[PDB]
Design an enzyme around this catalytic site. Structure first.
Site, short mmCIF file in Angstrom:
data_model
loop_
_atom_site.label_atom_id
_atom_site.label_comp_id
_atom_site.label_asym_id
_atom_site.label_seq_id
_atom_site.Cartn_x
_atom_site.Cartn_y
_atom_site.Cartn_z
N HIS A 84 0.82 -1.21 0.00
CA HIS A 84 0.00 0.00 0.00
C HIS A 84 0.85 1.26 0.00
O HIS A 84 0.33 2.35 0.23
CB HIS A 84 -0.96 0.01 1.21
CG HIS A 84 -2.23 0.79 0.99
ND1 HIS A 84 -3.45 0.18 0.81
CD2 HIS A 84 -2.46 2.12 0.94
CE1 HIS A 84 -4.38 1.11 0.65
NE2 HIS A 84 -3.80 2.30 0.72
N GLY A 89 1.76 5.72 9.92
CA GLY A 89 3.16 5.65 9.55
C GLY A 89 3.94 4.57 10.26
O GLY A 89 5.16 4.70 10.37
N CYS A 148 3.33 1.07 9.51
CA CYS A 148 3.46 -0.07 8.61
C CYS A 148 4.90 -0.22 8.15
O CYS A 148 5.68 0.74 8.21
CB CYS A 148 2.48 0.08 7.44
SG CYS A 148 0.78 0.46 8.07
C1 LIG Z 1 -0.26 1.84 8.45
C2 LIG Z 1 -0.10 2.66 7.13
C3 LIG Z 1 1.02 3.75 7.25
O1 LIG Z 1 2.06 3.55 7.79
O2 LIG Z 1 0.82 5.03 6.67
C4 LIG Z 1 -0.30 5.72 7.22
C5 LIG Z 1 -1.45 5.74 6.20
C6 LIG Z 1 -1.69 1.99 9.00
C7 LIG Z 1 -1.74 1.47 10.42
C8 LIG Z 1 -2.90 2.07 11.11
C9 LIG Z 1 -2.96 3.60 11.02
C10 LIG Z 1 -3.57 4.02 12.17
N1 LIG Z 1 -3.07 3.04 13.31
C11 LIG Z 1 -2.72 1.89 12.70
O3 LIG Z 1 -2.28 0.96 13.27
N2 LIG Z 1 -2.59 1.24 8.10
C12 LIG Z 1 -3.63 1.95 7.31
O4 LIG Z 1 -3.77 3.13 7.41
C13 LIG Z 1 -4.55 1.16 6.35
C14 LIG Z 1 -6.00 1.58 6.60
C15 LIG Z 1 -6.39 1.13 8.04
O5 LIG Z 1 -5.63 0.50 8.72
C16 LIG Z 1 -7.77 1.50 8.62
N3 LIG Z 1 -8.49 0.27 8.91
C17 LIG Z 1 -8.97 -0.56 7.80
O6 LIG Z 1 -8.75 -0.25 6.69
C18 LIG Z 1 -9.72 -1.87 8.07
C19 LIG Z 1 -9.29 -3.11 7.66
C20 LIG Z 1 -10.20 -4.04 8.08
C21 LIG Z 1 -10.12 -5.56 7.84
O7 LIG Z 1 -11.18 -3.39 8.74
N4 LIG Z 1 -10.87 -2.02 8.72
C22 LIG Z 1 -7.56 2.33 9.88
C23 LIG Z 1 -6.56 3.44 9.62
C24 LIG Z 1 -8.94 2.89 10.24
C25 LIG Z 1 -4.23 1.48 4.90
C26 LIG Z 1 -2.71 1.23 4.66
C27 LIG Z 1 -1.79 2.36 4.19
C28 LIG Z 1 -0.30 2.08 3.94
C29 LIG Z 1 0.27 0.67 4.22
F1 LIG Z 1 1.60 0.43 4.02
C30 LIG Z 1 -0.64 -0.47 4.70
C31 LIG Z 1 -2.14 -0.18 4.91
#
Ligand SMILES: *[C@@H](CC(=O)OCC)[C@H](C[C@@H]1CCNC1=O)NC(=O)[C@@H](CC(=O)[C@@H](NC(=O)c1cc(C)on1)C(C)C)Cc1ccc(F)cc1
Ligand SMILES: *[C@@H](CC(=O)OCC)[C@H](C[C@@H]1CCNC1=O)NC(=O)[C@@H](CC(=O)[C@@H](NC(=O)c1cc(C)on1)C(C)C)Cc1ccc(F)cc1
Lengths: 305, 305
Positions: free
Chosen positions: A41, A143, A145
């Site tokens: 992502h 941030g 991931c």
């Molecule tokens: C990690 C992504 C990142 O590092 O950059 C910020 C966008 C992030 C972890 C979560 C953020 C808030 N606290 C966390 O632990 N992941 C994301 O933002 C992904 C979207 C989500 O996690 C949302 N939840 C869902 O989508 C969801 C999934 C299911 C099965 O049910 N609900 C929350 C933020 C609400 C998108 C993303 C972006 C970049 C990546 F590398 C991986 C994933």
């Protein structure tokens, strides 16, 4: 003496931590040999989170869009491959500090340390367990991931988890370093409910042995129980069933403390039916279920790395 | 989201960890520049533990009796000095990995990470607090001395604690890296009782802000209280008094959550007088008092190093 939520030393994973910028979005990546791993992502924004098409994104993207940084030194991407929900970024250089490592897919119940990072820099380290419903109770922000979980054996770091998402419930979901999600979760902002979590019975028993080793012994009663009768009670309180393989994994703690597993099972049967009545065990007023039999041993015997 | 007993990354302290053999006894030491620090009981055995005479021991001892090892490379001691209950071993070589460091004597209430080691190799890392009675609830075995506690600021490691002893009570006692013991403890096998510990009120309040940030909000009531009336109640439950300096240190959490400190104090006043009634806060059935206001911020805001 003493018992704490002990995590593995993080130095060897600190050396492999990079930041990965594709467009504006930035996250973390794991730099092993001549490949950097990171969630897929990174090639889509929050605008695409709703239902991203990862294959059109990387198709229309070159190795110059990927900006890997390691402190100040930037790295040059030569190729980019998509293994499930992870992204393999082949870079010209190879990480000098790449430790003896391996990629394992742990099972529900197993624990692992987590090194939470942001912008490719590590904030802290803590201990987690893969819940029976393939979630983890982590501590992650935006941030985070790219942050990874791992176990250690002397010098072999066993990467088992990369962080992708947080479910609205507060729990967290991720993949192995092969890009396959634990549980039925997929990286897109879509409502996905995790199963009903359960307590990890075997780990509760190992934790009870640790209390005995440390002096907390008030909960030991005089009874024994059959494996089935115990499971009949535990079933009522949302405890996972105890298999004979779990009984055998407790053999060492049983041998060390002189308490047969089924007598300990009798002590736990009473704790569930009558509660603890305001008393504590190893400083906790709840029964803890995120310590494996090995986690107790390595901490009460002192294995090093 | 989420909240865990987060420890600082340990890599920078891993690189400074050595083992120190004087006679048969072996322990751990901290290798900084051209000096290795270690407890001064490395020059006496358990036979001498009863009441050791450290000054006759080092007097009749040369720099060849001290065998410092760093993995496989042994180090050559050129001089040996005794700063209080620590031992400064000047060696020919200087640790290449010596990080930006400093030596601080923390205060009661402050937290720090601990990197537990044996034979100069690190087993694990966990988080601790200096109790109001200058003890810590650690997790140490035989051969753990030399293990150190520390804080971090980007790249400056602030060593604050070296492990020496364990009181029969299960708690632990140590010194700063200047050799001065925290509290009235001295390295000899003599009965020494620590004071009556107390709960770190300010930290309990910071932990309550962390719960609010994370969604646990059932304990918020509609009241406010004066600082004195709160202290009158807290006094009954063995809570440390809350000074205005503690109120000011909570300003940031107060500002961030929109809850005035004295209203939060009212919420805690009820929790102490009526208990929690089987409910949990951030997954704990007890009130946690080993998280500082800074520990919450760095974890709920995400400061990195
Ligand atoms: C990690 C992504 C990142 O590092 O950059 C910020 C966008 C992030 C972890 C979560 C953020 C808030 N606290 C966390 O632990 N992941 C994301 O933002 C992904 C979207 C989500 O996690 C949302 N939840 C869902 O989508 C969801 C999934 C299911 C099965 O049910 N609900 C929350 C933020 C609400 C998108 C993303 C972006 C970049 C990546 F590398 C991986 C994933
Ligand atoms: C650390 C010493 C080491 O690494 O080598 C093993 C001898 C050890 C830590 C404790 C061991 C058991 N678990 C621990 O955390 N320290 C000692 O063995 C010292 C002796 C003690 O700690 C005893 N307690 C007391 O003496 C005591 C003190 C007070 C105020 O009340 N009781 C316990 C073992 C019972 C001796 C020692 C040896 C070598 C060192 F480098 C420092 C201290």
């Amino acid at each position: 003496s003493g018992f704490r939520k002990m995590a593995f030393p993080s130095g060897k994973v600190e050396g492999c931590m990079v930041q990965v910028t594709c467009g504006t979005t930035t996250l973390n990546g794991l730099w092993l040999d001549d490949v950097v791993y990171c969630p897929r992502h990174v090639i889509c924004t929050s605008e695409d989170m709703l239902n991203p098409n990862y294959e059109d994104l990387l198709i229309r993207k070159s190795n110059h869009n990927f900006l890997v940084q390691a402190g100040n030194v930037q790295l040059r991407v030569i190729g980019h491959s998509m293994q499930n929900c992870v992204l393999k970024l082949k870079v010209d250089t190879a990480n000098p500090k790449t430790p003896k490592y391996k990629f394992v897919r742990i099972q529900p119940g197993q624990t692992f340390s987590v090194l939470a990072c942001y912008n490719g820099s590590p904030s802290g380290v803590y201990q987690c367990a893969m819940r029976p419903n393939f979630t983890i109770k982590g501590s992650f922000l935006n941030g985070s991931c790219g942050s990874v979980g791992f176990n250690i054996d002397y010098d072999c770091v066993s990467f088992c988890y990369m962080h992708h998402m947080e479910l609205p419930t507060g729990v967290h979901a991720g993949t192995d370093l092969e890009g396959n999600f634990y549980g039925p979760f997929v990286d897109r902002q879509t409502a996905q409910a995790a199963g009903t979590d359960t307590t990890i019975t075997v780990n509760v028993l190992a934790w009870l042995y640790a209390a005995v080793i440390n002096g907390d012994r008030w909960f030991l009663n005089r009874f024994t129980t059959t494996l089935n009768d115990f499971n009949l009670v535990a079933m009522k309180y949302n405890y996972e069933p105890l298999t004979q393989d779990h009984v055998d994994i407790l053999g060492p703690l049983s041998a060390q403390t002189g308490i047969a597993v089924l007598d300990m099972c009798a002590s736990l049967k009473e704790l569930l039916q009558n509660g603890m009545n305001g008393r504590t065990i190893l400083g906790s007023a709840l029964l803890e279920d995120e310590f494996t039999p090995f986690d107790v041993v390595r901490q009460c015997s002192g294995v090093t790395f």
